[PDB]
RNA sequence: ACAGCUGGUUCCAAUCGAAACAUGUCGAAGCAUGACCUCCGCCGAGGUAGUCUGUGAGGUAGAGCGACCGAUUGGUCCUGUCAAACUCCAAACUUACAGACGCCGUUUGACGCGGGGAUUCCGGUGCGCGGGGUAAGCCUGUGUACCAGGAGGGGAACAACCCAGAGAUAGGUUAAGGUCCCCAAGUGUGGAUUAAGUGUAAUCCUCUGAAGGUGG
RNA sequence: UGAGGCGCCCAAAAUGAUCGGGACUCAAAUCCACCACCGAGACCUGUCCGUACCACUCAUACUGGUAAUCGAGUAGAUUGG
RNA sequence: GUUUGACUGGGGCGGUACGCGCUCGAAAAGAUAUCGAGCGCGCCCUAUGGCUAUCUCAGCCGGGGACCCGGCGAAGAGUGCAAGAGCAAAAGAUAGCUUGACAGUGUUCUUCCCAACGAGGAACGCUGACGCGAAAGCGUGGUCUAGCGAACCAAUUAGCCUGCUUGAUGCGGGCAAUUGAUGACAGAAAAGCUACCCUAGGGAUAACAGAGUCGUCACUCGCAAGAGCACAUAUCGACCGAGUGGCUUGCUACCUCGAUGUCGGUUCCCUCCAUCCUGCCCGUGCAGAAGCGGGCAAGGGUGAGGUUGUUCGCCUAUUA
RNA sequence: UUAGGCGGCCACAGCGGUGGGGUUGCCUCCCGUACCCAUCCCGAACACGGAAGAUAAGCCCACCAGCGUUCCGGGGAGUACUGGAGUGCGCGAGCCUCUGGGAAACCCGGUUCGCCGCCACC
RNA sequence: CAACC
C-alpha cells in the first residue's frame, strides 16, 4: 500500500495524466490518497510519477495522518478512535491503519473519504523540479522519506 | 496523400512477408462463424476477393449474419457504426 | 532451403498429394467429400468432413474388405471399384451421411473410369452426389464384361491364380446382390 | 475495337438467350413540333433570347458505345450501358 | 559555399541515385594510401583520427584533409614509405542549394557529403614505431580542414 | 440603389461555454453542410478520459543487407562504406475488442436518440516528431498543452517560460523563486576551485561565443 | 606521458558602460553537500454569498442537510432581475 | 448591355500542386499540408473477356543466339499502360469451346477516416437467362488500386398512362432507361486597355524605411600546399576549415496603407574603427634615402577642380 | 500406421547425406494394350487389364547438422532506440539525469533432419 | 537609386 500526494498542479499537465489522478481520487495539490499495490494501480502511479510523491508509510505515520486528516464520506464529524470504533470494523485508528497497510480494506469501505487533504509541508519540501534521487520531492520515496513528507504535511 | 484511391498508402498492410507468399490454405477461407462471434479483420494479401476497405484492417468486429458466403460484421469506425461485408479468408476468431 | 526469403510449398504440395485449388472449390459446397482413390492393386472410398485439427472420415470402404462378403476376384478393376463405392456409400448412410461431392484427388476425369464407378456405386447406395450419367461407363463394363471378352481372346488364362478361366461378371451381380440386402454386417 | 455483328446473349423480351444483331443507333429526325420547339418561337424576340441564344456545346475526347441489340427471333431490340471506345468496327 | 550550410544533420537522408540525377563527381582521389598491396596487420602501430561531434563532411573537405595528411606522410616517409592510411567514409548524402523567392524552393543538386557520428574513426593509419609521430602530425593537419574537433587516438601501440 | 467591405449597435446578474478545422462552392475578406458550443424533449442502465491482462492490427526509431534492391572501396577469399521513394530483422509507441480495477451514472438519468438556437471555417506560442529553405521573430504539416478567452505569485520590463487555474472576507502554511543593500528572508555551515569582475544570464529574436591554441 | 576542473588567447561598431542597479574576490562567483528562513488568491482553517442537489413544503416562501469529487472566461446558447 | 474565373511566399509574366491513380514525404492503427520528391490517367482490347483441358516460366550448364534432348532453377518470367501490391498442378503459357463485357433488383463500403454531401466506383447478395466443367465450382469484363460528368433538351429502346363536353384521326404531355458535355471536371453562354480615372477596404498583400536572417557582401582567424635564385612564414599566398559585422544584395511579410514624403546633393551636429595622414613602435629580401609588411593609437586632419542628376567611378593639379 | 488414405499447422517440415525394410499381406517400381480412355507423334504420361520379377527409385523406419530455418542459454546489451518529467549541461547541432519500456547484427554453446488430428490396417 | 513590368 502506497501513499500518493499530488505535489504539482494541473496547469500544463497532460490531460490523460490529470484524469489518472482524478481516478485515484485526487483533485487538488497536497491531496493524498492510499493505493493498493496491484498491477493495475502500479501503471497508474507510474504514469503520474512526475507530478506526485509516493511510497509506503509506516504504521505510526499513517496513524498520525488519519487522526489529523481523515474525513467521513460526508460531514465535518471528527475521525478519532471513538469515531473509528463507532463506525468501522476496527476498534481504533491503529486497527484501521493496519488494515489499510495490509490492504484488507479501503477508506471508502469504512465510510471515510478516499482522500486525505493534507497541509502544505512545514519547512517546505525538497522541490518539484527533480526526483528524489536528485534531491527533489517527486517520485517513489523511502518509507522514511515518505514519512518525513507526510508528517511535515500532517 | 498525393492521391485518394482505396489502396493509397497500403504498401505494407497488403504485402505478404516473403514466406507467407503464395496461395493461402483453404481452411480459413471456409471457416464458419456464428452470429455474435468476435472476429478480427485482416486482409490476406494472397486473397483477391471478399476484402473490406483497407482502412478497416485491425478492427475486431461482431458477426451479425451473412450475405451469400460472405459475412456481415459490425464495427465502430471512430464513433460511427458500420457494417462490413467480408469473407472468412480475411477473418480470424478472437482469443 | 536457399535462404530466409525462400518459399517452401505446403507439405502436401511438396509431396504432390493435394491439389489445394481443387480442394478449396470442393469445400465450398459445405457437403462432405466422397474421396475416391486408387492403388495399383486396390481402390478406396472415404466420406470425409471438415474438422478443427484436420479432416474427419465418417465412413469408408476398401476394396480389400470386399472379399469379407464373398469376393475372390482381383481388387483393381471396374467391378471392384463400383462395389467398393457402394459399400462405402451404404456405411455412409449408416452414419447419417446423406450427400456428398466427388473428390477424385489427382486422378483424371476420364469418362468411364473407376473413380466415376466408385461414384455410381456410392450414389446407388442412396447418397445424393452431383454427377453426370453420360460420363459413367455403361452398365456392362461396370459388371466387368470388358474383361470377360478379353478372356475370350484366351489361349492362356487371363488370371494366373485360379479364380476361373472365362472369369465372371455374374459374381459382381452376386456381390452387389449381397450388399443391397438389409442383413449384411456393415 | 472490334465488335461481333451477331452473337448469343440475353433478350429481356423473350426472357431467354437468343442470337442478336448489333447496330449503331442512327439519329432519328426531328419534327419541329415538340414543346421545346414552340417555346423557342414564343420566347425569342427583340434582343437576347436567354437559353435560345446559347450555341452548341463541345465534345468529349471519346464517346461511349451507342448500340441497339436486336433479338433474332422476336425482332425487338433493347439498349445497354455504353463504354468509351475510340472506334467501333463490326466483324461481318 | 561555407560549410555552415551543410555541416549539420538537419535533413532526411538523401542518397537514392535512382531518384536523383545530376550529382557532381566526388573530389576524393583515393581512399587507400601508402602501400595498399600490404595488409594493415603487418604493422605494429595503428592510429585513427576520431571525430568528436556528429557532422556532415563535404567531399571537398575530405579531399583536402586526406590530401594534406597523406601529402605529409609522403614528404616524411617517401613516395613509397612503409605505411598505409585509409579514409573509411564515402560521401553518400546528396546536397542541395536553392539558387523565384521561396516559391518552388526545392534546391538543385550541388554536391555530396559523408555523415560521421561523434566517436567514429574518419581516418586510420598503420605504421612502424619510427613513423608514429609523423602520422600524428599528418592527422593534426587533417583535422584542421574538417569542421569538428578530433581525437588522435593510438590503437595498437604500447611503445610509450 | 446595392456591397460578401470599414465603423457603430445604449441596463444588472445567474448556468454552460466554443470554433479559428472537414466536404462543396466563379470559392478562398463570403456561404452552405459537418465537427464543436448551448437549450428543450424522448429513452432507461449502463458508460469508459486512466491502468493491467488477454486476443489482434502496424514497419517509424534503431539495426542490417554472404536477405532482396540500388548505391558505394581497394588487393593478390580478404578488406572500405550506404538508403525518404531498400528490408532477413525490429522497438518504444499508437490503435480494435474484451475482461478486471479505478472513476462515473440509475431523485444530479449517465450512454443513446429527436428537435430549437448559435457562434465558427485570418489563429498564435511552447514542447515532441517533422518536410522545404543558408537561415529567419520564415513557409507548410502533425500530436499535445497553453495564449487567444486565464487572474494571482515569480521572471528587471515582457500574450502563451516557471508556480498557479480564481466567489467574498479573515488567520495560517507553502509553490515557483529568492535570503549583502535597493527589497521580505543568511553578509548561514563544512569544503574546494577561479583572479578573469571570468562570473553574479534556467528557457529566449532577447542569454553568444567557434575552429584553433594555452609550462595560467 | 595520459585524464579531469576552472580560467586565459582567439574576441572589431556606431548618443551613455553595465549582471535590473549598487556593487561583490577564503565571494554577494563556480562546483559538492548541508542548516535555517522569506515568499501567492495555491494548500489548511473560521464565518458569509452564489450555484447544484437532498429533506420538509403548494412554494421556485421558510427551516434543516450535502459539495475532497461546485465557484476563471471572448463568440455564442439559456434564465431571474 | 455585359463578361473577361480560381490557385499564387503581393500582382503580372511562368506554371496548374483546378478532376483522377501509385510510391515517398507521413512521425509502425486511421487521418494529414506546401509552386514538396519520383511519376502516371482522360485509353486500349471480341480478345488482350469467360470457362475447361493440357502445362510451367526467366536465366545458366551439358549433348545434337532458330529447333530437338537432359539437368539446375519458388518466380528473377509473364500477366496491355504509372507505381506499389497479388499470382506457379495459377491469376502465367498453349489448345479448344464460349459470349457473364447478360437482364431485373438490392445489401454494404467507398466517394466524404472520424462526421453530413451527388455522380462515379468496388465488394457481396437475391431473381431471371445462359456458357464451360464429371462435379464441386467459376463467369456481375481485363488480378487489385486511374480511364470520369448534374438539371433542362434531343435522339434512341419496350410497354403502358394521358391531352379541357364527346367520338375519330393528326400532333403533343408523361412513367423507366441508354446515348450526346460541361477537363474552371459537384456543370455561367463570355476579350482587353486606363498614366483621364473613380469607390470600398487591406499593413489580411507589394514598393521606401524599420525588424529578423546572413546564402550574398565586407572584414578576421585556423591549417600552410605553393613561390619567394636557397629559403612556408621579408613578402605573396591556393584548397579546405572556423568566425565577426550588419555598409551591399537576397529572403520573410512582424510593424505602418483613416499616408512615418521616395534618389543624389546641400547645410549642421554627434559617433564608430576594420587607421589614409599625423605620434610612438616591430620586422625586412633593413647601408643610406626610400620602399614593403606588422603593432599601439580615434587627439586632430582628410581639401579644390573636369564629364555625369548621378551614388560609385573615371580624370587633373595640389596635399602630411 | 512391417510400408496405407484424407488432412490441420505450412521449412522446427527445406537442401544434402548414411544405414535398414517386404513369397500368396500394404505402397510401389514392375508386366501388358482387347476394352473405357489417351498422346497436335509416342500405352512416356493419362486410362484400363494384370501379377513373372524387385526392394535398385519412390515410400516407410533409424539416424547425421555441413547449408537454410525455429526456439533457448551465455556474451554483445539494459547497449542502440524510446513513452513521461526537469530553472540539468552545451555557443550551438546536441547531450545528461530520474521514471517506465527495450532491440538488431554478430560470436560461442544447445535445440531443430517435423508436430498434431481423423479413418483404415497382424 | 528614387513600385508596378
Ligand atoms: Cl468495407
Ligand atoms: Cl489416388
Ligand atoms: Cl457506337
Ligand atoms: Cl480552470
Ligand atoms: Cl566591476
Ligand atoms: Cl437579481
Ligand atoms: K502604408
Ligand atoms: K504605379
Ligand atoms: Mg466532506
Ligand atoms: Mg526550490
Ligand atoms: Mg511505410
Ligand atoms: Mg449580463
Ligand atoms: Mg443571480
Ligand atoms: Mg535509419
Ligand atoms: Mg479572440
Ligand atoms: Mg531586508
Ligand atoms: Mg562579462
Ligand atoms: Mg515559509
Ligand atoms: Mg445592369
Ligand atoms: Mg488574385
Ligand atoms: Mg499511418
Ligand atoms: Mg445548359
Ligand atoms: Mg442519342
Ligand atoms: Mg469544382
Ligand atoms: Mg471533389
Ligand atoms: Mg480611392
Ligand atoms: Mg503583415
Ligand atoms: Mg508626418
Ligand atoms: Mg585597432
Ligand atoms: Mg573624436
Ligand atoms: Mg536400399
Ligand atoms: Mg543554455
Ligand atoms: Na499466402
Ligand atoms: Na409568349
Ligand atoms: Na514566379
Ligand atoms: Na453591389
Ligand atoms: Na482557419
Ligand atoms: Na473557402
Ligand atoms: Na467575399
Ligand atoms: Na466498469
Ligand atoms: Na531517432
Ligand atoms: Na485555458
Ligand atoms: Na512584476
Ligand atoms: Na562582469
Ligand atoms: Na459569456
Ligand atoms: Na468567369
Ligand atoms: Na454512389
Ligand atoms: Na536585409
Ligand atoms: Na555574422
Ligand atoms: Na537626399
Ligand atoms: Na584619430
Ligand atoms: Na566629379
Ligand atoms: Na525401395
Ligand atoms: Sr412572345
Ligand atoms: Sr432575338
Ligand atoms: Sr473537348
Ligand atoms: Sr531541416
Ligand atoms: Sr576542426
Ligand atoms: Sr466552467
Ligand atoms: Sr502514428
Ligand atoms: Sr556568506
Ligand atoms: Sr566556503
Ligand atoms: Sr528584439
Ligand atoms: Sr544560449
Ligand atoms: Sr576553443
Ligand atoms: Sr463565478
Ligand atoms: Sr463562471
Ligand atoms: Sr469592361
Ligand atoms: Sr515580388
Ligand atoms: Sr476481378
Ligand atoms: Sr491582346
Ligand atoms: Sr501619358
Ligand atoms: Sr497613421
Ligand atoms: Sr580598438
Ligand atoms: Sr604613419
Ligand atoms: Sr557610374
Ligand atoms: Sr511400360
Ligand atoms: Sr555558433
Ligand atoms: Sr525489462
Swiss-Prot record, chain A:
Residues 114-146 are annotated as: Disordered. Gene3D superfamilies: 1.10.15.30, Ribosomal protein L30, ferredoxin-like fold domain (3.30.1390.20). Coiled coil: none annotated. GO terms for cellular component: cytosolic large ribosomal subunit. Keywords: Ribonucleoprotein, Ribosomal protein, RNA-binding, rRNA-binding. It holds the Pfam family Ribosomal_L30. Residues 123-144 have a biased composition (Basic and acidic residues). One of its GO terms (molecular function) is rRNA binding. One of its GO terms (biological process) is translation. Belongs to the universal ribosomal protein uL30 family. NCBIfam families: PRK06049.1, uL30_arch. Part of the 50S ribosomal subunit. Binds 5S rRNA. This is one of 5 proteins that mediate the attachment of the 5S rRNA onto the large ribosomal subunit, stabilizing the orientation of adjacent RNA domains. This is Large ribosomal subunit protein uL30.
Swiss-Prot record, chain B:
GO terms for cellular component: ribonucleoprotein complex; ribosome. GO terms for biological process: translation. GO terms for molecular function: rRNA binding; structural constituent of ribosome. SUPFAM superfamilies: Translation proteins SH3-like domain. The keyword Chloroplast does not apply. Disulfide bonds: none annotated. Keywords: Ribonucleoprotein, Ribosomal protein, RNA-binding, rRNA-binding. It comes from the Archaea. Residues 1-65 are annotated as: Disordered. InterPro entries: Ribosomal_eL21, Ribosomal_eL21_arc, Ribosomal_eL21_CS, Ribosomal_eL21_sf, Translation_prot_SH3-like_sf. Part of the 50S ribosomal subunit. Interacts with protein L18 and binds the 5S rRNA. Has been cross-linked to L18. Belongs to the eukaryotic ribosomal protein eL21 family. This is one of 5 proteins that mediate the attachment of the 5S rRNA onto the large ribosomal subunit, stabilizing the orientation of adjacent RNA domains. This is Large ribosomal subunit protein eL21. The lineage of its organism: Archaea, Methanobacteriati, Methanobacteriota, Stenosarchaea group, Halobacteria.
Curated annotation (Swiss-Prot), chain C:
It comes from the Archaea. Keywords: Ribonucleoprotein, Ribosomal protein, RNA-binding, rRNA-binding. The keyword DNA repair does not apply. GO terms for biological process: ribosomal large subunit assembly; translation. GO terms for cellular component: cytosolic large ribosomal subunit. The keyword RNA-binding applies. One of its GO terms (molecular function) is structural constituent of ribosome. InterPro entries: Rbsml_uL18_euk. NCBIfam families: PRK08569.1. Belongs to the universal ribosomal protein uL18 family. This is one of 5 proteins that mediate the attachment of the 5S rRNA onto the large ribosomal subunit, where it forms part of the central protuberance and stabilizes the orientation of adjacent RNA domains. Part of the 50S ribosomal subunit. Interacts with proteins L5 and L21e, and attaches the 5S rRNA to the 23S rRNA. Has been cross-linked to L21e. This is Large ribosomal subunit protein uL18. The gene is rpl18.
UniProtKB/Swiss-Prot annotation, chain D:
GO terms for cellular component: ribonucleoprotein complex; ribosome. A zinc finger (C4-type) spans 11-74. Keywords: Metal-binding, Ribonucleoprotein, Ribosomal protein, RNA-binding, rRNA-binding, tRNA-binding, Zinc, Zinc-finger. Zn(2+) binds at residues 11, 14, 71, 74. Residues 22-63 are annotated as: Disordered. GO terms for molecular function: large ribosomal subunit rRNA binding; structural constituent of ribosome; tRNA binding; zinc ion binding. Its cofactor is Zn(2+). InterPro entries: Ribosomal_eL44, Ribosomal_LSU_eL42, Ribosomal_zn-bd. One of its GO terms (biological process) is translation. The keyword Isomerase does not apply. The keyword Manganese does not apply. SUPFAM superfamilies: Zn-binding ribosomal proteins (SSF57829). Part of the 50S ribosomal subunit. Interacts weakly with protein L15e. Binds the E site tRNA. Binds to the 23S rRNA. Binds deacetylated tRNA in the E site; when the tRNA binds a stretch of 7 amino acids are displaced to allow binding. Belongs to the eukaryotic ribosomal protein eL42 family. This is Large ribosomal subunit protein eL42. It comes from Haloarcula marismortui (strain ATCC 43049 / DSM 3752 / JCM 8966 / VKM B-1809) (Halobacterium marismortui). The lineage of its organism: Archaea, Methanobacteriati, Methanobacteriota, Stenosarchaea group, Halobacteria.
Amino acid at each position: 500500500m502506497h501513499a500518493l500526494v499530488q505535489l504539482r498542479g494541473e496547469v500544463n499537465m497532460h490531460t490523460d495524466i490529470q484524469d489518472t489522478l482524478e481516478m485515484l481520487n485526487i483533485h487538488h495539490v497536497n491531496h493524498c490518497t492510499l493505493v493498493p499495490e496491484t498491477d493495475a494501480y502500479r501503471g497508474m502511479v507510474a504514469k503520474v510519477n512526475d507530478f506526485v510523491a509516493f511510497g509506503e508509510p509506516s504504521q505510526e505515520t499513517l496513524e498520525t495522518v488519519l487522526a489529523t486528516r481523515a474525513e467521513p464520506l460526508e460531514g465535518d464529524a471528527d475521525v478519532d478512535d471513538e469515531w473509528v470504533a463507532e463506525h468501522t470494523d476496527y476498534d481504533d485508528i491503529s486497527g484501521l491503519a493496519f488494515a489499510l497497510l495490509s490492504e484488507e480494506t479501503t477508506l471508502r469501505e469504512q465510510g471515510l473519504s478516499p482522500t486525505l487533504r493534507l497541509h502544505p509541508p512545514r519547512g517546505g519540501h525538497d522541490g518539484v523540479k527533480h526526483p528524489v534521487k536528485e534531491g527533489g520531492q517527486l517520485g517513489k520515496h523511502d518509507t522514511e522519506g515518505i514519512d518525513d513528507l507526510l508528517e511535515a504535511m500532517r | 496523400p498525393s492521391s485518394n484511391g482505396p489502396l493509397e498508402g497500403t504498401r505494407g498492410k497488403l504485402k505478404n512477408k516473403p514466406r507467407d507468399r503464395g496461395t493461402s490454405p483453404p481452411q480459413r477461407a471456409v471457416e464458419e462463424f456464428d452470429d455474435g462471434e468476435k472476429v478480427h479483420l485482416k486482409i490476406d494479401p494472397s486473397v483477391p476477393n471478399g476484402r473490406f476497405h483497407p482502412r478497416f484492417d485491425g478492427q475486431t468486429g461482431t458477426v451479425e449474419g451473412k450475405q451469400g458466403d460472405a459475412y456481415k460484421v459490425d464495427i465502430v469506425d471512430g464513433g460511427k457504426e458500420k457494417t462490413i461485408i467480408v469473407t472468412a479468408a480475411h477473418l480470424r476468431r478472437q482469443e | 532451403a536457399t535462404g530466409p526469403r525462400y518459399k517452401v510449398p505446403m507439405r502436401r504440395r511438396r509431396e504432390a498429394r493435394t491439389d489445394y485449388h481443387q480442394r478449396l472449390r470442393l469445400l465450398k459446397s459445405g457437403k462432405p467429400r466422397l474421396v475416391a482413390r486408387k492403388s495399383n492393386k486396390h481402390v478406396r472410398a472415404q466420406l470425409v468432413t471438415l474438422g478443427p485439427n484436420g479432416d474427419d472420415t465418417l465412413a469408408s470402404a476398401h476394396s480389400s474388405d470386399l472379399a469379407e462378403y464373398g469376393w475372390e476376384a482381383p481388387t483393381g478393376n471396374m467391378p471392384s471399384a463400383y462395389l467398393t463405392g457402394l459399400l462405402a456409400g451404404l456405411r455412409a448412410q449408416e452414419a447419417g451421411v446423406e450427400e456428398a461431392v466427388l473428390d477424385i484427388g489427382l486422378n483424371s476425369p476420364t469418362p468411364g473410369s473407376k473413380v466415376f464407378a466408385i461414384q455410381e456405386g456410392a450414389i446407388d447406395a442412396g447418397l445424393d452426389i452431383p454427377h453426370n450419367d453420360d460420363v459413367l461407363a455403361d452398365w456392362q463394363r461396370t459388371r466387368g464384361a470388358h474383361i470377360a471378352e478379353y478372356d475370350e481372346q484366351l489361349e492362356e488364362p487371363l488370371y494366373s491364380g485360379d479364380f476361373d478361366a472365362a472369369d465372371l461378371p455374374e459374381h459382381f451381380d452376386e456381390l452387389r446382390e449381397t450388399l443391397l440386402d438389409g442383413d449384411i454386417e456393415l | 475495337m472490334q465488335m461481333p455483328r451477331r452473337f448469343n446473349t440475353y433478350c429481356p423480351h423473350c426472357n431467354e438467350h437468343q442470337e442478336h444483331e448489333v447496330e449503331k443507333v442512327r439519329s432519328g429526325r426531328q419534327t419541329g413540333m415538340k414543346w421545346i420547339d414552340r417555346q423557342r418561337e414564343r420566347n425569342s424576340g427583340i434582343g437576347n433570347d436567354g437559353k435560345f441564344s446559347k450555341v452548341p456545346g463541345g465534345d468529349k475526347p471519346t464517346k461511349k458505345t451507342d448500340l441497339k441489340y436486336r433479338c433474332g427471333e422476336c425482332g425487338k431490340a433493347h439498349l445497354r450501358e455504353g463504354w468509351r471506345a475510340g472506334r467501333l468496327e463490326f466483324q461481318e | 559555399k561555407p560549410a555552415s550550410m551543410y555541416r549539420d544533420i538537419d535533413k532526411p537522408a538523401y542518397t537514392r541515385r535512382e531518384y536523383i540525377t545530376g550529382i557532381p563527381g566526388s573530389k576524393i582521389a583515393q581512399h587507400k594510401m601508402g602501400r595498399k598491396q600490404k595488409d594493415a596487420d603487418d604493422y605494429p602501430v595503428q592510429i585513427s583520427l576520431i571525430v568528436e561531434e556528429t557532422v556532415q563532411l563535404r567531399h571537398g573537405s575530405l579531399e583536402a584533409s586526406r590530401l594534406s595528411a597523406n601529402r605529409h606522410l609522403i614528404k616524411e616517409l617517401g613516395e613509397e614509405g612503409d605505411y598505409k592510411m585509409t579514409l573509411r567514409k564515402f560521401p553518400h548524402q546528396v546536397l542541395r542549394e536553392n539558387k523565384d523567392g521561396m516559391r518552388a524552393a526545392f534546391g538543385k543538386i550541388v554536391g555530396t557529403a559523408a555523415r560521421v557520428q561523434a566517436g567514429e574513426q574518419l581516418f586510420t593509419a598503420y605504421c612502424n614505431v619510427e613513423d608514429a609521430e609523423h602520422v600524428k602530425e599528418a592527422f593534426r593537419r587533417a583535422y584542421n580542414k574538417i569542421t569538428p574537433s578530433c581525437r588522435i587516438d593510438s590503437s595498437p601501440a604500447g611503445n610509450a
